[model samples]
Target: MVLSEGEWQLVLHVWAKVEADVAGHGQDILIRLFKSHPETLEKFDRFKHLKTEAEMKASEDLKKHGVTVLTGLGAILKKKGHHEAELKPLAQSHATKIPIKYLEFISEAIIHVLHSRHPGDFGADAQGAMNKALELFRKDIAAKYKELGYQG
Candidate 1:
């Protein structure tokens, strides 16, 4: 729940990586996370297989739309300090189903696996980019929760 800057960076990295394609990359991330933190999987009722299938399908449907959304948001965030306002709402929403702390852990684990699997995808600047993206993502989710009038 109390993620350090480095942890948040990992979350962003994993999110960005999986957004490109959920099946291969996303499944890999979940599998690695489940292996590294087996107990964390108990937070969700369904098993990883089901989760993977659902994610893959959802991602397939949303690929173009999702990329457009992310690209637009990323462009905005690149201009100024728009990300600071996004963290708490995102955490609150995530807290409804799973503790924000555990989410952070799972995110970090995914990033670690991704970077290890494809080092060429990024350069030394990737960490900084990830950090910024994480901040923005947290803000976006927080806004979603606020709009829904719930504090998850």
Candidate 2:
């Protein structure tokens, strides 16, 4: 496992807090991601049609997509050490057009929201474990990108 049992416990505990507001938090993360990396919205096929920040903000599709992605992340966290298995398909679809660094942006957005929403629990220790787990996912996804001959 990438994380010790204790680290995994920390991740899951903070995740439980996130679980209650997945819809709200997930959408917020997506908005923050697009805002931080506007190119992502342009390059990604699913979001390419959103011509403006307002359009993206008003997009129901974007909101549902946010929930969808975060739900997938939750699944990955539940399984712990099996991130590669969960992220392979995600990387395959995105590798061609989306830069791998966008995944790191998403990771940062997640952590940002967690810290904002629950400053009490998502302190240094929890953030450390969460970052470790997300980095494992990122590394595995990068390998998948390489396997697929990604240019981005």
Candidate 3:
């Protein structure tokens, strides 16, 4: 959400450099996320019929999905529009297809990728910003499907 100038720049710079490597890293990120939580693949029709990580890497659907997701994320970071109209709405729509909890998994996947590739770039503020953003996504989406005391 809110970050100091230096910390904001840190996040921005990392993403800026990351543009050149989006498809590779994006696909890898999703692959690692799916591998770590195999059940999540059931949410992806493209991956649901698949058998191997090698196959996942080779699919045009996977690469296209990766780019779509990465582009959405890049737009969010760049503040192209209201997140409520853009990112959170995506979480809300995707919640119908996948568990809302997967957003946390997605966040951790992204954090792991960033943490692995740019350890120094994610100090407390940057890390917290990421956590905050995911939390917001979950918060907004969960409100759309609620009970007196929901558990799903």
Candidate 4:
């Protein structure tokens, strides 16, 4: 809700470009996240065995994981007002499955990817809008963490 209509337009426009190569983008995002925060990977018992980038790339399950995450995110984006409800399931699961605080790290990783992908596209307003959106997303997920009785 922090975003103006124009800001939403800016985000959606960039999202369209990324969604075109949905699977690839997903892989890239996950790869960057895991590499940057290897400790985060420990949260996923299944993925823990796959340490290196090449190992992850070759793992079919991990590839599917990337797709699932991005698809879920894309679904939420398509429904503009869908915030906490959209992410509730993920938050619920991650409360036990992954360290909920890692959600914030994931958000930063995502923003990094978006900025890297199109540095020129996100001017001050656009980047601020995107950051605000991600913050809300993280807050919702974190709220669910507390609701689930899982501390940070």
Best by lDDT: 2
Q: Which lDDT tens digits does candidate 3 get at residues 17-90?
A: 66888997788788887888878878877657765889989888888888888878777766522355565556
What's the lDDT for candidate 1?
0.51
- In the range 13-131, model 1's lDDT, one tens digit per residue, is 54566557645554555555666776765654544343453563454433443344344444434434444444454444355464445556655754575577667754446655554
Runs of candidate 1 exceeding 4 Å displacement: 1-20, 48-93, 139-152
RMSD vs true structure, all candidates: 7.5, 2.3, 3.4, 2.0
Per-residue lDDT for 38-140 in model 2, tens only?
Answer: 7767655666677566787788888788888888899899888776678777886777566757888889999998899899988999999999999888777
Listed in order, each prediction's TM-score against the native is: 0.49, 0.87, 0.78, 0.86
| Per-residue lDDT value at 15 in model 2 | 88
Number of the candidate with higher TM-score, 1 or 3: 3
Candidate 2, position 8, lDDT = 91
lDDT score of model 4? 0.76
**TM-score of candidate 3 against the unseen true structure:** 0.78
**What's model 1's lDDT at 26?**
48
- For each candidate in the order shown, give its overall lDDT on alpha carbons: 0.51, 0.82, 0.69, 0.76
